[PDB]
Write a structure and sequence with these properties.
part of a larger assembly; 5 chains; A: alpha+beta; two-stranded antiparallel sheet; two-stranded antiparallel ribbon; globular; C: mainly alpha; Baseplate hub protein (chain E); Baseplate protein (chain C)
Chain lengths: 176, 176, 48, 394, 326
Amino acid sequence: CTVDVADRRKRFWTTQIAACGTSSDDCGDCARPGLQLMCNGQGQVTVSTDNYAVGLALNILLTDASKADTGCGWTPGNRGGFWGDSFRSDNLRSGSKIRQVPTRTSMRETVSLIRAYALDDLKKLVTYGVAKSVDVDLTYRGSNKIDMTVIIQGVDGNESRVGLTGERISNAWVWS
Amino acid sequence: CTVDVADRRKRFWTTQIAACGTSSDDCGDCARPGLQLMCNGQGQVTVSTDNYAVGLALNILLTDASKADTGCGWTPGNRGGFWGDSFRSDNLRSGSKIRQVPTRTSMRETVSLIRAYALDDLKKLVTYGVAKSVDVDLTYRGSNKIDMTVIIQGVDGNESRVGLTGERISNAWVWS
Amino acid sequence: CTIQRPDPQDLRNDIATRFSTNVLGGAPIIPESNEFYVVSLEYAMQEE
Amino acid sequence: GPCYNPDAEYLPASFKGFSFDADSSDSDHGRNGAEAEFVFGERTGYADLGIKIKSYQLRARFQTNDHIAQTNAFIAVLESPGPGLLVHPTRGTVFAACRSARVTDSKVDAAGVTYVELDFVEANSVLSGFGLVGNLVALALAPIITATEGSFKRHFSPDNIRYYNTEAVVSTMAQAVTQVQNAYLAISGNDTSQDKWTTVRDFRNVLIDEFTFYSPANAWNVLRNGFAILDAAATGSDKFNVLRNLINWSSTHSDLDGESGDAENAIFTAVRVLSAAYLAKAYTETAATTVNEGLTQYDLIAAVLEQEAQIAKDDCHDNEFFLQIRAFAVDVARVMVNRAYNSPSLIVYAFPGTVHGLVAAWEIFGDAKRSRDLEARNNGSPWAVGPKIISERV
Amino acid sequence: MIKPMRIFIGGEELVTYTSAQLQRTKKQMTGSLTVEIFLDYVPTKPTIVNAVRGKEILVYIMGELAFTGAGGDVSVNFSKGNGYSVTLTARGRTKYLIDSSQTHPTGFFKNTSDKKVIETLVKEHNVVLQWDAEEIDEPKVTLRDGNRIYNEIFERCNQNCHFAYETRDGKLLITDGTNGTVGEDIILGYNILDFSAEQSEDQANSQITVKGHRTQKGVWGNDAIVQPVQTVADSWVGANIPLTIQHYGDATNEGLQRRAKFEADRRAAESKSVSVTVFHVWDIGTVHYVEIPPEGIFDVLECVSLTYTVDAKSTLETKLELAPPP
């Protein structure tokens, strides 16, 4: 009984930044995310399950969404997306489309376009009920360099504040 | 019989200004209101019941009301008000909100805000039926200092005037 | 029976061995972990 | 702003793939509800009735040496059947459907330019047959009942068992029906209506006669109607202990051999499976007090069902009943899990130290009369509840 | 494609119908199609007419049969400004049973069953009977001289509970229960464009007492004048609202109780009438779960009626009338 206060809900494997190490290519150092294997005292490895929200954000940013219908067409196998979206019930798509920007001159317009796309795609974190106020701060024009820091606002696993305007996220058990 | 006229309604205890005495703090002398105990000829103390309207006005001004919904929320126990308001039938709130002014520059504007809040709160004196013409004359800007003279128009326990625009309020037995 | 219905324990050992050789790269599994429960489900599904 | 770049902030307009440049952008959001005006009263009412359908209004321009061809192509696209995907300049992508498109075009007043006034509506599909949504709030007991019927009539034929065991087998059946009768009588209690007099008369009449349970049809009909009456006699919590006792009674195995053991085991399996089904239905009829309570009740039922599924397969008695039991188990799993986690959405508020029941209820809900609800969930004196409190989602 | 209908007067797939209303019901024997055709007239060129007054039609709804039976009438209208319309009406193939007059030679069926008396009261106009209830035996069946092919059936299926209506193929269904075939759980907030539930109290009855007389062979006196009675009760209404609906053939105990329960289901099914208007266009006896919490419906109800309506402007909606969850 009284023990109750701890959800029996668990978390599955989570993709993590720099799980497979950096990859230098003389332009900089990338992250190459993947799955982190946590070892034990006596063999018995196990996949890690931390940073759930960042895991969803990586799953969203780093997967191509469906392309838009053009008169040119697409190769049967290049039109992006996931067939598993045919079975979900929330009536949404899976992935992002930052890599589908219609490039143009005057890189300020390209920056604004990428901002719009990244924000529209990351809003699915709030729509799923995992964060509350995800937001981006994409600001640069350089030659082509761009910085795109992302903030994923979260909660705790026990409602400690009374009288909020919104409504507790539906999945505040991941701790966001 | 002919010696009837005496409303059999009594008055309960009333909070009074300076019942517990002033509290010097080198900036001035405040009032510290409480309950006045009247002694008798032979022991037998008793709580006074004078100055009912000013007592209600004190209970209104010196009680924090429920705060407004924000985006961050409030601690479960700091959101003001009184649970006893869940049982009254007049559909109103108990307390005042002059301590919740969103302070700003140009103290003239804070003066106007405190005026609006105090007048909105003290209109409940007329709404409950204890006064008729409450009004304030908040007029200063100084450094931060402000005067807030309050007038509470009252009546007597016998209608001695005929042909009024309004009505004998509701509770003219408290003498207002 | 008509197909074969192998010994349960042997079937679970084979399922766990496949899961360790493929996903965990050859290491055994922590009891009462996510992978342990995944293996138990698969087993139930193969039984069905 | 001073350096606001307009065409880098408004999205380029396009409907159904055909792109065009827009000159305006409107919308008609809203929300529709009633308005009550009770007679002779200084009061008013309001009742929110849903969402108001959105509509968008645009104005396209065509200023090019070939604006006639572009206008005609645009007209051909706008009159194509069905809704299409629209890119509103200031609201992004929506699914809209054209409703009117006026095409104004003068010659000796303004030659060269063509303006088009467009009026779109938010357009979503439905499906075709008015929304085949499934009431996942509910358990369906018909499939498992028919499966138990099949499994019972497959292994119960008191005309095909050895003559020196038929009496024992039929006596086992009669004893099971006696158990269900005692269950009903213990659950009805203070029921006085004449239905309660006739049902009791029918139980005796069926238990007195001798040749009733010698046929599988009558045996199964008696059992199924007895369970249906035991269900229809009370509601919710009341039916717990009774049903649980049945699960204990039918948790034994038969000592006879050959087909006799199979017949008695069919009786026990039918009773246990029916009781687990109706106990799940009884759990569903009452609201969960805590997440752990709902999960523990589901664990009980899933344990019983899995035990019966492993029994129905040990030497491949009947594979079909094993499959049916497994499907029923996943069904009751979804129902009981949704009941434990989402029937009331329970949260654990963390107060700074213990508070009263009234104070906690009024801080959480804004209404202290709901303090009566904080007593069934939290243990602790009414004057010190917490400092962690389980309650409903606001 | 949203396309529901494709009407065939004989093979001519209607492509001009400016509107349509198709109604099916259990309270009656037939349905009612109502098409609206354009029918232009150029007063110099030759024009052609269709005098069908009987040429047979069907309405495949959303790629499936809905009706089967322009027999009704032709109603060519006129006006100066919006004239030249043709309203065609088409009842159900089980119609002549409704507008005829019995022409069976004998008139006195002896030692027959209601099924048989119904088979010979129908096979005079080639309407195959979908008997799916039971066989009840009755000694004396005298048909009132030329009454009506439908009044007599309705009389013979009311004193032994049997709903009498028409299916989608074009047959006469004499049932006793439901058509099974469960379906969409209409929930308030999900698809109900409009709803109206009305469970009144002026059309209910606590005790229904059925009396009558025995019409068997040899039975006379008390056993045919005194005994036959029955008192069925609906332990849901409330106070003593009695009644006495008398019987009109071979009053057996089962016959009495059965006529009684038939009416005790009629009055029941009228004491909670739920009309719902849903959106897009299979429920003539279907049961559905319905959820309208504000009026306290959380129950499984049977659709008594079904009406598809259309009009090229703002329509495509279906109106269902449902059956109470006692």
